Symmetry: D2
Subunit: 420 residues, 4 copies
């Protein structure tokens, strides 16, 4: 069979490793979202469109370099390239816009420049903030305050860049929306030979907590100048996916390199192969065993849907979401099935890329008179969207996750549907 | 906590054994159905009513002793005592009627008397047939043929009573509806020291097949004369439940003994305690791992519902059934939650006692004009009944299993309900 | 390779990856070949006082002889000890087939008051004077009760093993403190089934056996195991079930109280208990049992404990017929037993008391070495090795090629075990 | 007063992370402050070239932890490689003054390959005969595609080259497909990712690496991870975040050896790359989840009636039970040490042998620390055995392996000869 299914059927992880096949082509859609740093090499509207077609999910704006005028233009080009595909909603791919802060610099609270960068992001409608150099939970609260009452929906991903941040990780993760393993600065503050330990630990604690985790810095570094990466670069990218990272990131690879689209395509290729090599048998059992009991129907429905999808090898789990939460809760159980999130919120659709295996679609049509009808219309939108994108074929089984009443947090239904 | 919950939380079976508490009272309803052999000591309509209140689920008619007139009278008195409780529809407990055949005696095929006995059972509306001395799959086919065209809906439980029956078990189970470990005759054909091996093997193979299994003969033998059983008798009963038997049975204990109701009450008491001592953590994992993948939504919904019920420690899994199949498929995954089956079929309600943890409700209310309304009215019937019988309290969580259109084999929905 | 050995003593059922597949692979035609591990304790009464009949019970597999001091005078029980030791030493002519038997004293109990009853003090002093090996302390409810029994033994009764009978609710609740100070536990289901609901007795049994297995201390299942056999020649289906399940639960010993003491079939009950125990031992799922027992056992800096886990692991790897261990106090063999190997722990000791007492730990087969000590200890141990090997070649335990694990020490005495060595037979 | 000095232990070398019941819990328990204390297991293979040819710099590489010296026969004349052998052996035997701290180094020959078309290359025949004549210990057979290719290399060595270990470099798709037959006839495998990354898609190389390492771990045969491990260190003093990651992951995957090519052969930081590979490998070994690794390795290993194999599993089990500092094994061929290594113990497998070749070759097995016993054989073998055993104890005492009060597992045999191992004995230090 295909997509490492004989390797996934193995009773032991050693058996699984021995059953890995280079000829077993991956068929599932690429789960681990790609974050591309936008710079001179990736700012043109034609090239940005190419990167979207290549699989860029999030666009990073590094506020360490660049003026507010430069970054406002970065956003416009990004938006314009994304919106050119709006004419065909069944194929429109949303892209999130993230702001990577410059950092507290001198050491104390939040830098004055960062307050001005954060209020700019709020004004320009950014979805995610990569908080540079977070060392404690008070640093996160300061960033949340710097966004104000308008920046409430914006996701805060804390960049762990030093030893203090690693030690105080649990308090930072509790108050953050997710973590970024910013290996660049981290490789300097702590010994370079200990960085993998911090990466693997953070990814593990994030997987345990259900919160997104981003692997960052020098993933395909040689591709800035060369058309093909090193054997260690392909290895690192594949291992970040195998470790359980929700996102993979490109810095100078897409910002100032000669091969921006090629780095995106390469990251996509490796991530797709690594996802099929995931030992879901033990991964799901351990994730389920580790997850505490829940009396929230959204969480209870998530584990039931993931279990049901595993049983029939469901091609996708279509979930109707409003804030992204239902999709995030399905993602935490790491299913082999694609979590197709259908939401009317464009912000939630962009943000849900931080979760692994979540494929957002934006329902652009107005709500129907009968809620039951409007719900079924969105389920069909996700079936039609997944059919033209290759996710679904006729005769496939899908798990459909819905709620009992309109509004966020009412998810409670899982239903087994047969395609067409 | 109560119902061996600290013992169930343990990561290892040894830790589970060490965590068993005598003071941890069981709270869940008694799953393992009790089959009581009706004889002179239990013929009384007055006494039958007491045994129904004591927890008798199935009434066995041993055709080795007794005339057709004697047994048609026993059935008439059983049904009289059962329909006396039909005034309260939320608390009406259905009882199945089983016919235990005399056996092939000599051997050319099915005995001449058995053909008459089987024709009688069909005419008298029996639900289950205990086929005595089954040695091959041809023996089962002969019994099904004997049940003519009318009797095609009677469940056939094959009594494995000899060495040939044990050897040819897999072919017999494939054609049977379930197995009875008839240890009486079995303990004579094969060495008495090897009977436990055959019992444990058959129960294991039946659990793996999802088919019911009955433990029979000398379970509380001393209680025929004495008011209290031996330490080995309580042990055997508890161990049959721990082994994974769907049903426990009383022969002379209830048919000709001085303590018929007391034996039923005692079997109930032991079974309730043994069910709380079940290590569901490994049991469910092994049962799930062993069960093959399925493209049947009834099957897929069952594993999703059982997984969702474990996650929240759901009070009960309310399933709407017609043939009892949906409830049986939930039972095979051995949930801690009570599978409350809500059916309009009187026969299916009686027969569903063969599956462990299935609590049937006969829905006598008239069909509503709108099917979705009728489904919800039936779903609420299960909630009303369980809540009345102590199964449910307000604020509890239940897993509700339904289907997309009316008619059997369309089950595909699992929905997390919060009581009242 | 062993052709018939593939379908043998539930080996296909033991090879299974899951316990459910293990249950499905159990075969009635797979005859057990290994020696019977779970020791049998027979209560000696009027039906079993006869020296002639005692000899039959020894040949039938009785390992320990119980003296119930609830009935009988000191003269009545001293005669029993003489009858027993007489039958015991009748087989001493052939030391290679010499089966030692332990003598246990079951106390009457504290009656109805705080402290050890006055009769119990006399009974315990009697046992010390008569050289009993084990004491079944009736109605133990706390760790102070055990200390009182140990004090009543005095300076002479130091080697005597104290098995605490848990017979009531207080004893069940205070189990961990009682086990810490006891040498082992008896699940005295008779009295226990009265103090706590009869439907909760199996819970207490399974818990105690589990905690004893965890602690490495012996555990005895007692009362009404083959109760119907007091009057009838064959037991009930529930009785064979209970006996088999006690073995499957992990009990080191099975007992016959009243089934041998006053029943028409004393030898037949012993033979039946032996037959069931042998079948149940082959049905043990050693794959998960050993993994769980190893995982649960704490790490140790004691070479006797470290050697035990290494020897049990080595025996599983090659399907060693037996693990021959050279003990002095029965500790090295007890430490091997706690890891529950499929191989027979053949204990070779010069201590007659330790040889009798080592019956309390499951799978331990004691062989009293009567030959005199050689001038060189580095010669003595090597001859003590061959003594145990030839007892297996006589008793059927071993055949040519049947590899064995040999457990010895660096110097002679108590607790200097540190060597495990893989030996090939002939 | 605050007598918890065993709190410092159990908190070092990822011991809290190793004690976890689940692999997720293990990942969550990994600590950057938990310093590794055990000796570095995964052997380092350094490619010798212009940057690493001087005897002076070779001595620093040996002190930095180089275990095997690779001679790439794709570049270089027979005169150049023979001079490299003299410079290497000269630098190695400079430390022979203290046998209790002498570190042996193996010499490997990496062949040029069959070139353009089937059959063993004509240059390779000359190269292989040269290696035999010059006493090489290992041969990295370039571009092995089937079991016949291995047999051709074994034949090309001749009757003299019988002890030489043959590590087959899997460099193409055919080699990956026909892996099981190649491993059966090879002494070990090299995951030569350089050539491999060209023959098969670059995104599928990790799959081939992880599969090969897994099958090698299953078979008990050594496995080497090769090509671009610390590539940026050829020019820069510090590696990339992906390079440290890849090195650590090769160890975590279960590779017995890690390798440096241009990194030491033609780079500006040869010693620094060796020191860096050592640093990462040491940290990655403490992060190994031995709890499931040992259970899976034991479960997967077939039952054996060979006492050498039975003693190995018993010794590894006994070492985990007491957290033995080291497992001292007496070996002649290196087989007893290899069989202990396959079960992947946390204890250091200290191999004591009188064979200089076996001592060099035993570096291919992970966690095997060879010490060459130069003392003369005693008249009675019985005494001589417990003095070679004591040599290992005194060697560990000096080399920081053994502290007083520690426990060691000692693995010996019943008679002098290969494969006669059958004894495991628990010894307390000093
Ligand atoms: C304490 N001692 C002496 C022990 C005895 C037996 C075993 S065992 O045979 O390996 N063991 C049997 C019990 N199961 S299990 O409980 O998870 C269970 C798995 C099923 O698949 C299955 O159908 C039924 C059961 C089951 C359920 C409730 C009570 N009883 C059995 C786990 C596996 C031990 N494992 O570790 N310690 C063990
Ligand atoms: C949540 N995330 C981060 C996870 C990722 C992957 C897996 S997994 O693929 O099932 N997983 C891989 C790691 N092994 S293992 O560590 O026991 C190991 C078993 C071997 O047989 C073997 O050859 C090598 C190893 C091994 C690998 C890395 C470090 N030290 C040892 C266990 C099984 C997870 N299981 O639970 N959580 C998992
Ligand atoms: O995933 P979230 O953010 O909790 O919200 C998902 C919600 O979407 C629905 O499926 C559809 O309802 P809406 O009309 O608000 O879109 C709800 O029933 C469910 O609560
Ligand atoms: O258990 P069964 O035989 O599959 O029957 C359950 C059936 O009953 C329902 O739950 C309700 O419909 P009806 O009771 O009107 O047949 C169906 O949707 C489902 O297919
Ligand atoms: O059973 P124990 O108390 O652990 O002792 C076993 C003893 O066996 C021996 O191998 C032999 O002891 P002896 O020569 O004194 O009989 C000792 O080294 C060890 O102390
Ligand atoms: O590693 P190998 O080839 O199995 O050799 C191990 C051998 O070493 C010894 O300990 C000593 O052997 P030598 O005297 O031949 O060196 C043997 O008893 C054992 O058989």
């Amino acid at each position: 069979q295909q997509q490492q299914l004989p390797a996934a059927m193995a009773d032991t992880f050693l058996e699984h490793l021995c059953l890995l096949d280079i000829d077993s082509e991956p068929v599932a859609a690429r789960s681990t979202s790609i974050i591309a740093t936008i710079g001179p090499a990736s700012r043109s509207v034609e090239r940005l469109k190419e990167m979207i077609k290549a699989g860029m999910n999030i666009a990073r704006l590094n506020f360490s370099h660049g003026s507010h005028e430069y970054h406002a233009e970065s956003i416009a080009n990004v938006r314009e390239a994304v919106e050119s595909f709006a004419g065909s909603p069944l194929s429109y791919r949303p892209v999130a816009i993230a702001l990577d802060t410059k950092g507290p610099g001198s050491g104390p609270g939040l830098s004055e420049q960062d307050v001005r960068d954060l209020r700019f992001g709020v004004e320009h409608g950014v979805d995610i903030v990569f908080a540079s150099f977070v060392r404690k939970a008070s640093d996160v609260a300061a960033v949340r305050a710097a966004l104000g009452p308008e920046g409430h929906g914006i996701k805060i991903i804390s960049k762990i860049e030093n030893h203090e941040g690693v030690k105080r990780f649990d308090e930072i993760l509790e108050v953050s929306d997710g973590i970024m393993v910013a290996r660049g600065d981290l490789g300097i503050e702590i010994p370079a030979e200990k960085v993998f330990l911090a990466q693997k630990m953070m990814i593990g604690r994030c997987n345990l907590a259900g919160k997104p985790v981003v692997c960052a810095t020098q993933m395909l570094e040689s591709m800035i100048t060369k058309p093909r990466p090193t054997r260690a670069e392909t290895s690192d990218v594949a291992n970040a996916v195998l470790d359980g990272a929700d996102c993979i990131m490109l810095s100078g690879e897409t910002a100032k390199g000669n091969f921006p689209v090629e780095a995106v395509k390469m990251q996509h290729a490796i991530a797709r192969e690594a996802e099929a090599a995931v030992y879901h048998r033990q991964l799901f059992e351990e994730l389920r065993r580790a997850a505490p009991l829940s009396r929230d129907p959204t969480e209870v429905t998530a584990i039931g849907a993931v279990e049901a999808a595993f049983k029939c090898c469901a091609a996708a789990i279509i979930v109707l979401t409003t804030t992204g939460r239902s999709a995030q809760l399905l993602s935490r159980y790491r299913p082999r099935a694609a979590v197709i999130a259908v939401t009317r919120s464009a912000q939630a659709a962009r943000q849900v890329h931080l979760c692994r295996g979540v494929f957002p679609l934006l329902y652009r049509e107005p709500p129907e008179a009968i809620w039951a009808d409007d719900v079924d219309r969105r389920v069909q939108f996700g079936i039609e969207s997944g059919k033209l994108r290759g996710f679904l074929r006729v005769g496939d089984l899908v798990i459909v996750v819905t709620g009992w009443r309109p509004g966020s947090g009412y998810t409670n239904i899982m239903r087994v549907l047969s395609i067409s």
